[PDB]
């Protein structure tokens, strides 16, 4: 019985608090009170329509065939205005909806299945999912979170442990290159890949013939933001515009560098294209802690499309040929590592051999360092990695790419003076210690902009410096003051995230506790009643579990990430796909299959509930006669785990065979059969560090490489003379090597004049900030 009034008419949803910093005045005052640098704002000319065939003559046929729009919009208007960027912060105080909704259906299913099954780890799984729903929130944070994050970046760059250039730490570019030959081994781009000699639009071959139509340019994310000067547009809406701007920037830089006044011309070009150095401060979608919603929102520094394209032309042809890591090469690098197809078992073999031989082991992946020492596994992270970067760290990376990558077999460069100018003299100041845009505020960026094309490379170089210093200090244990003292020595902040003690014993336990029943145990299509012990390496988010069926370690997503993803799944996030009938149900099948694939299969309660949910949805589709095989075959794009499992289809339900297939190696592994690094093959990181400590490799031997190192020290007014010094090697003229040797000797002599010594990175920053 209820009242007529009533008759007439699980954790609660998180509602973010009202944000007092959601206005430019309140945000600017907050930054000023915290001594965070706000730049004097710069303006961008309004858009003007130009004919595509006049602006992009190489693409005339594409316009004629109606495959490319006949006009391009370029910032050449008579009036200039200050740009404004307003991100979407969801959920927020006024809107708590489907976006960022926890998976309450899964929570209810986990509860129903726990009541029917005696899984000993079931109560803890349910408690963890419930706790993640109650304490976390998937979404894009707030203005307060973004602003507090900027303060933390400034603190890392300038606070307790101010940043240090590699030169201040004590490394020349050549010494860093010698370390990188070991920690980031690279191959040269393919011989058929064009050298760095052209405007980007010249790398597009279009005639209409599908057999020959090709682009030699990097690939792009069509749906990603165009960045400045096209706020609110995607890369798909602005490709022709990005080509026009990237061609103009490189052309104007090249012409200015060899002009009668290189300083005036180069500074003018940099100031005219200032917006190419300013990133949109995009709030990253993550599973944030509810209590810290307004204290921390991670940011993506959204690079202008022309800058992204020019930087990617330098890095991508090298990196595409350099998937060299500890599982296939004798290097500490984890670049291109996948734990699938036997990857995790290769890591476990290396770890086990190190333990048996009483050897220390180090692995590097961008801002992640893994150390095995004293029967202990250490997972180390640079503290807010990107904030530690100086423009000189990126310049050292450019030096490494141009000397080890962009070089012909005879030692001649695979670039001309224009591209050496962009790469060495200008590019590092465009994305490091430059600026970002939030609302109408042009803010200083402390360190490198997170998300720029060189994010991984610059972070990897900073970790390389920390590791080289650890080797130099006699490998002090990560838990000691001697290890923590490397922060001040390098100017790079870091912290120990995990300490996995009694490693040898933990590995023995993982093998011995491997279940006899279920998936990868006796090979049935059921989770084990009692999962075995995981080796919680947190190796790029992965733990290792022993399989009795396959007699190898296989990866499982770290428990905490698995639980967070089960509690707050990412939505479809594609409005076009969402409007197609069956896309939502296909995405739900994908969500439950992918959570099982990455490690849910080994969690009996999670596996039971997720299997029921995907099977129930497949049965409904079968009864209804609705075919979603198309969406299920092309599942990767609709899953946060899509990049982890390429080449598999979800059209058939997950079975033990799926788990076997994703873990099957193409080849057997012998760690001793791994090739040595392409450069200095016989040398190890330890031998390189010893050589450096003794004062070796200060200067490269190659005259071409010496010109590139001198390029980092000479002021922009010397660019015309530097172009003349590089011209014989760049043109591969008869006797170029002797000519280069002579020109490098003459330039070294002229450098005795201190008035000619100024970093072009400082000159670039000054021109970018000019008002
Ligand atoms: Cl940031
Ligand atoms: K620092
Ligand atoms: Mg890490």
């Amino acid at each position: 019985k209820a009242s007529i009034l009533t008759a007439l008419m699980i954790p609660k949803r998180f509602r973010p608090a009202k944000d007092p910093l959601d206005s430019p005045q309140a945000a600017a005052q907050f930054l000023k009170d915290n001594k965070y640098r706000i730049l004097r704002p710069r303006a961008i000319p309004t858009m003007v329509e130009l004919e595509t065939d006049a602006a992009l003559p190489r693409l005339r046929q594409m316009v004629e065939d109606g495959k490319l729009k006949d006009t391009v919009s370029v910032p050449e208007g008579t009036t200039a205005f200050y740009p404004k960027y307003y991100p979407f912060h969801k959920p927020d105080h006024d809107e708590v909806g489907t976006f960022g909704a926890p998976d309450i259906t899964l929570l209810k299913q986990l509860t129903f299945f726990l009541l029917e099954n005696d899984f000993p780890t079931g109560p803890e799984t349910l408690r963890q999912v419930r706790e993640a729903i109650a304490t976390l929130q998937y979404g894009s944070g707030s203005y307060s979170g973004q602003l507090n994050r900027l303060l933390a970046m400034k603190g890392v760059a300038t606070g307790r442990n101010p940043n240090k250039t590699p030169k201040t730490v004590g490394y020349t570019n050549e010494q860093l290159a010698k370390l990188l030959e070991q920690t980031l081994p690279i191959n040269t781009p393919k011989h058929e890949d064009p050298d760095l000699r052209w405007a980007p639009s010249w790398l597009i071959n279009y005639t209409g013939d599908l057999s020959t139509d090709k682009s030699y340019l990097p690939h792009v994310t069509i749906k990603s933001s165009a960045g400045l000067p096209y706020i609110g547009k995607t890369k798909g809406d602005t490709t022709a515009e990005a080509l026009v701007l990237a061609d103009s920037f490189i052309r104007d830089l090249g012409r200015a560098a060899t002009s009668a006044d290189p300083e005036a011309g180069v500074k003018k070009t940099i100031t005219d294209f200032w917006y190419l150095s300013c990133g949109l401060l995009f709030p990253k979608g993550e599973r944030y802690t509810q209590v810290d919603w307004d204290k921390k929102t991670r940011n993506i520094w959204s690079a202008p499309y022309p800058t992204h394209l020019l930087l990617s032309m330098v890095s991508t042809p090298v990196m595409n040929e350099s998937k060299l890591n500890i599982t296939n090469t004798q290097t500490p690098s984890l670049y291109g590592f996948s734990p699938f197809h036997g990857g995790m078992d290769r890591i476990m073999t290396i770890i086990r051999d190190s333990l048996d031989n009483d050897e220390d082991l180090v692995m590097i992946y961008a801002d992640n360092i893994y150390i095995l020492q004293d029967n202990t596994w250490y997972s180390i992270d640079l503290e807010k990695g990107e904030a530690n970067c100086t423009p000189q760290h990126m310049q050292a990376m450019m030096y490494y790419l141009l000397t080890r990558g962009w070089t012909n077999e005879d030692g001649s460069p695979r670039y001309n003076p224009t591209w050496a100018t962009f790469a060495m003299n200008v590019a590092p100041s465009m994305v490091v210690d430059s600026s970002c845009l939030l609302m109408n505020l042009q803010l200083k960026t402390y360190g490198q902009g997170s998300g720029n094309a060189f994010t991984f490379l610059n972070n990897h170089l900073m970790s390389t410096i920390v590791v080289a210093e650890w080797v130099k200090a006699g490998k002090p244990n990560p838990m000691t003051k001697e290890f923590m003292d490397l922060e001040e020595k390098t100017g790079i902040n870091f912290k120990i995230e995990r300490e996995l003690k009694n490693l040898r014993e933990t590995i023995v336990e993982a093998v011995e506790t491997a279940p006899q029943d279920g998936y990868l145990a006796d090979g049935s299509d059921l989770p084990p009643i009692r999962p075995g012990k995981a080796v919680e390496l947190d190796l790029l988010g992965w733990s290792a579990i022993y399989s009795r069926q396959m007699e190898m370690f296989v990866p499982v997503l770290e428990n905490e990430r698995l639980i967070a993803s089960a509690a707050y799944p990412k939505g479809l996030e594609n409005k076009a796909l969402a409007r197609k009938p069956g896309a939502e149900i296909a995405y739900q099948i994908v969500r439950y299959e992918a959570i099982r694939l990455v490690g849910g299969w080994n969690n009996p309660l999670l596996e039971t509930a997720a299997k029921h949910m995907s099977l129930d949805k497949r049965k409904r589709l079968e009864v209804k006669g609705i075919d979603v095989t198309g969406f299920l075959d092309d599942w990767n794009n609709m899953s946060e785990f899509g990049g982890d499992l390429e080449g598999i289809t979800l059209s058939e339900p997950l079975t033990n065979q799926t788990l076997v297939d994703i873990n099957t190696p193409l080849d057997s592994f012998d760690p001793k059969a791994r090739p040595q690094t392409p450069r200095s093959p016989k040398k190890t990181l330890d031998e390189v560090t010893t050589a450096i400590t003794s004062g070796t490799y200060k200067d490269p031997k190659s005259a071409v490489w010496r010109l590139l190192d001198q390029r980092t020290k000479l002021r922009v007014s010397t660019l015309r003379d530097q172009a003349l010094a590089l011209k014989p090697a760049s043109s591969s003229v008869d006797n170029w090597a002797e000519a280069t040797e002579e020109l490098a000797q003459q330039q070294q002599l002229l450098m005795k004049a201190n008035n000619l010594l100024k970093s072009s990175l400082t000159e670039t920053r000054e021109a970018l900030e000019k008002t």
Side-chain angles (χ1 to χ4, degrees), residues 1-11 13-39 41-63 65-68 70-222 224-574 576-618 620-645 647-726 728-741 743-747 749-751 753-771:
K1 287 210 196 289
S3 96
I4 294 291
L5 210 47
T6 300
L8 281 169
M9 302 173 188
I10 287 110
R13 279 296 298 273
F14 170 65
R15 185 172 298 269
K18 283 172 189 281
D19 189 349
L21 305 181
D22 73 352
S23 70
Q25 303 73 22
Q29 190 58 57
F30 175 80
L31 293 169
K32 285 179 210 164
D33 290 349
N34 289 281
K35 293 155 189 169
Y36 187 105
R37 192 188 168 204
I38 301 171
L39 306 198
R42 300 144 299 178
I44 307 173
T46 51
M47 297 299 163
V48 156
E49 253 181 45
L50 296 188
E51 285 175 11
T52 308
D53 50 39
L56 292 167
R58 295 275 301 197
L59 312 183
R60 285 198 174 106
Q61 197 61 60
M62 214 177 317
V63 177
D65 297 357
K67 291 189 196 166
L68 178 60
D70 56 1
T71 62
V72 288
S73 306
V74 297
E76 288 177 2
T78 59
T79 54
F81 297 108
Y82 302 113
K84 288 98 188 171
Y85 166 65
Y86 305 94
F88 287 105
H89 296 109
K90 293 298 162 191
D92 65 18
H93 191 76
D94 304 317
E95 191 186 338
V96 177
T98 61
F99 182 82
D103 197 343
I104 299 305
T105 305
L106 178 62
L107 179 63
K108 286 165 175 173
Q109 292 303 125
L110 293 166
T111 313
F112 280 119
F113 284 108
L114 183 52
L115 290 160
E116 291 171 16
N117 293 277
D118 297 342
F119 298 138
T121 71
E124 190 53 23
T125 300
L126 179 62
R127 194 201 60 77
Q128 285 176 2
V129 172
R130 207 183 258 138
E131 176 187 61
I133 291 171
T135 68
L136 309 173
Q137 178 60 58
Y138 178 79
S140 55
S142 62
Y143 278 115
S144 283
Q146 288 192 274
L147 295 157
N148 278 294
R149 175 65 173 195
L150 289 182
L151 298 190
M153 303 303 270
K154 176 172 80 77
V156 166
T158 69
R160 69 177 183 83
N161 187 45
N163 293 350
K164 289 181 177 184
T165 60
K167 180 179 179 180
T168 298
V169 183
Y171 298 92
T172 64
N173 287 328
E174 187 60 14
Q175 290 173 329
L176 288 176
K178 296 300 294 194
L179 289 171
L180 292 162
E181 286 179 352
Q182 304 312 317
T183 73
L184 192 75
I186 61 167
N187 281 311
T188 68
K190 297 205 282 284
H191 291 199
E192 63 263 35
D193 289 339
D195 286 3
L196 295 170
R197 296 179 184 277
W198 324 94
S201 74
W202 289 44
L203 272 71
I204 300 151
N205 172 32
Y206 175 93
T207 59
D209 182 14
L210 274 93
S211 64
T212 57
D213 282 354
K214 206 196 173 173
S215 161
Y216 293 92
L217 287 171
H219 286 207
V220 296
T221 303
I222 285 174
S224 68
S225 172
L228 290 174
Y230 303 99
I231 297 168
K233 304 283 184 71
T234 63
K235 286 194 174 64
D237 305 320
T238 56
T239 300
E241 284 76 12
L243 291 168
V244 174
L245 296 177
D247 287 358
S248 298
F249 186 63
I250 207 91
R251 179 182 68 248
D252 292 1
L253 215 49
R255 284 177 185 173
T258 60
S259 70
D261 196 344
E263 183 181 323
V266 166
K267 285 181 157 291
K268 180 185 148 56
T269 299
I270 294 171
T271 299
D272 287 356
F273 288 93
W274 74 267
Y275 56 82
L276 293 191
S277 74
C278 187
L280 303 179
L281 200 75
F282 180 93
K284 197 175 184 299
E286 271 175 1
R287 283 129 191 148
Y288 296 111
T289 294
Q290 289 176 24
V291 299
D292 304 324
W293 190 253
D294 296 314
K295 299 174 201 167
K296 176 197 164 178
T297 304
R298 282 191 206 163
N299 298 310
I300 295 165
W301 193 94
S302 313
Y305 196 175
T307 305
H308 175 71
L309 187 60
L310 294 172
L311 290 180
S312 301
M313 284 172 70
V314 180
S315 57
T316 69
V318 170
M319 301 317 293
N320 288 353
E321 285 299 291
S322 311
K323 312 290 171 209
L324 306 175
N325 60 62
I326 202 163
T327 71
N328 62 39
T329 304
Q330 294 182 55
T331 175
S333 185
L334 283 161
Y335 183 75
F337 170 74
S338 171
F340 294 104
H341 304 100
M344 183 56 80
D345 195 61
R346 290 190 169 206
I347 293 291
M348 293 299 300
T349 298
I350 292 150
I351 289 170
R352 293 158 93 192
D353 292 350
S354 299
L355 289 165
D356 294 351
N357 299 314
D358 203 57
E359 298 166 347
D360 293 341
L361 181 67
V362 66
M363 304 182 203
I364 306 162
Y365 189 87
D367 59 328
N368 307 278
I369 295 161
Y370 301 94
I371 290 169
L372 194 178
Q373 88 177 94
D374 308 313
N375 192 32
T376 315
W377 176 261
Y378 302 92
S379 178
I380 296 140
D381 292 318
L382 303 186
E383 177 186 19
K384 292 165 183 85
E386 290 87 338
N388 298 281
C389 199
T390 68
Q392 289 72 22
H393 282 99
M394 179 164 171
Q395 190 174 55
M397 179 51 61
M398 283 291 199
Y399 172 91
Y400 180 63
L401 295 174
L402 268 67
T403 60
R404 277 72 174 170
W406 298 100
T407 187
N408 290 305
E409 288 179 46
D410 67 356
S412 67
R414 288 183 64 179
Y415 54 85
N416 61 17
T418 295
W419 274 90
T421 302
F422 168 72
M424 302 308 299
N425 298 112
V426 178
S429 274
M430 293 176 80
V431 304
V432 191
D433 287 329
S434 60
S435 63
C436 66
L437 181 67
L438 185 62
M439 304 186 234
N440 64 326
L441 304 175
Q442 290 174 35
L443 306 173
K444 172 53 50 179
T445 296
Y446 291 86
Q448 68 165 337
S450 189
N452 87 79
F454 276 58
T455 302
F456 173 95
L457 300 168
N458 294 341
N459 280 350
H460 200 94
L461 170 55
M462 289 187 288
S463 289
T464 292
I465 293 168
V466 175
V467 170
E469 285 297 319
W470 167 74
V471 174
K472 181 183 184 190
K475 298 168 176 187
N477 183 278
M479 303 313 288
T480 67
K481 197 186 185 284
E482 291 71 26
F483 187 90
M484 296 315 298
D485 288 346
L486 303 170
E487 284 192 305
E488 189 184 334
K489 183 88 156 66
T490 65
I492 302 158
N493 297 33
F494 53 75
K495 51 187 176 160
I496 286 59
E497 297 279 17
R498 190 164 305 192
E499 175 189 25
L500 193 57
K501 298 178 191 180
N502 311 300
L503 190 59
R504 194 175 285 113
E505 301 85 346
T506 301
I507 296 167
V508 168
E509 195 188 355
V511 173
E512 290 179 350
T513 64
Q516 284 168 24
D517 63 301
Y519 292 131
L520 305 183
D522 62 357
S524 70
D525 297 335
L526 290 167
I529 290 147
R530 190 178 296 273
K533 168 83 171 167
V535 183
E536 301 190 286
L537 299 175
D538 192 38
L539 182 73
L540 308 184
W542 307 94
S543 293
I545 270 288
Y546 190 77
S547 163
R548 278 186 194 271
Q549 179 176 42
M550 299 185 79
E551 301 182 18
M552 63 190 276
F553 282 95
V554 298
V556 295
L557 191 66
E558 279 276 322
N559 189 68
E560 194 175 287
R561 300 174 186 251
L562 187 72
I563 296 304
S565 183
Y568 283 97
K570 292 197 192 223
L572 194 42
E573 295 176 348
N574 183 338
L577 201 52
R579 67 176 60 106
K580 297 185 180 182
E584 181 52 39
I585 192 165
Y587 154 81
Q588 283 170 358
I589 293 167
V590 169
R591 169 206 291 176
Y592 300 117
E593 293 301 65
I595 205 77
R596 295 163 72 193
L597 269 164
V598 301
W601 65 266
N602 206 38
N603 183 308
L605 188 60
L606 181 56
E607 166 57 21
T608 306
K611 179 183 192 156
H612 167 78
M613 293 173 86
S614 61
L615 291 189
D616 178 70
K617 289 168 199 302
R618 294 180 187 269
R620 282 181 66 79
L621 289 165
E622 185 227 292
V623 167
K624 293 166 187 300
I626 297 162
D627 191 327
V628 299
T629 66
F631 303 123
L632 301 181
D633 287 341
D634 202 75
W635 73 273
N636 309 77
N637 313 282
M638 75 211 283
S639 173
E640 74 179 296
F641 303 115
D644 299 307
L645 297 139
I648 77 135
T649 179
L650 299 187
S651 65
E652 289 303 304
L654 184 149
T655 64
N656 189 70
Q657 197 62 44
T658 319
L659 300 175
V660 164
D661 295 348
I662 67 174
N663 285 302
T664 297
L666 283 159
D667 303 300
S668 57
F669 181 59
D670 179 9
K672 284 171 170 281
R674 286 171 301 161
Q676 284 169 329
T677 53
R679 311 261 174 173
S680 306
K682 298 173 177 217
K683 303 291 178 168
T684 64
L685 174 60
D686 293 8
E687 292 178 291
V688 179
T689 300
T690 298
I692 294 168
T693 298
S694 83
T696 314
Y697 313 126
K698 274 172 182 170
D699 302 295
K701 303 286 173 208
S702 153
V704 171
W705 296 8
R706 276 184 269 128
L707 291 176
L708 205 75
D709 191 34
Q710 291 163 0
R711 184 171 285 278
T712 74
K713 297 160 190 170
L714 294 159
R715 67 186 289 155
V716 298
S717 66
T718 71
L719 286 166
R720 185 187 62 251
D721 295 308
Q722 290 188 64
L724 287 173
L726 181 59
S730 169
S731 301
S732 275
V733 300
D734 169 64
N735 211 44
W736 67 266
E738 244 191 53
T740 308
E741 185 56 48
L743 291 151
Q745 273 179 31
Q746 178 181 38
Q747 201 170 264
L749 284 177
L750 292 158
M751 279 177 82
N754 218 316
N755 68 296
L756 299 183
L757 304 179
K758 189 176 181 185
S759 176
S760 60
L761 304 184
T762 299
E763 300 180 288
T764 298
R765 185 177 48 251
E766 292 168 341
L768 289 166
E769 297 178 1
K770 191 182 180 176
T771 57

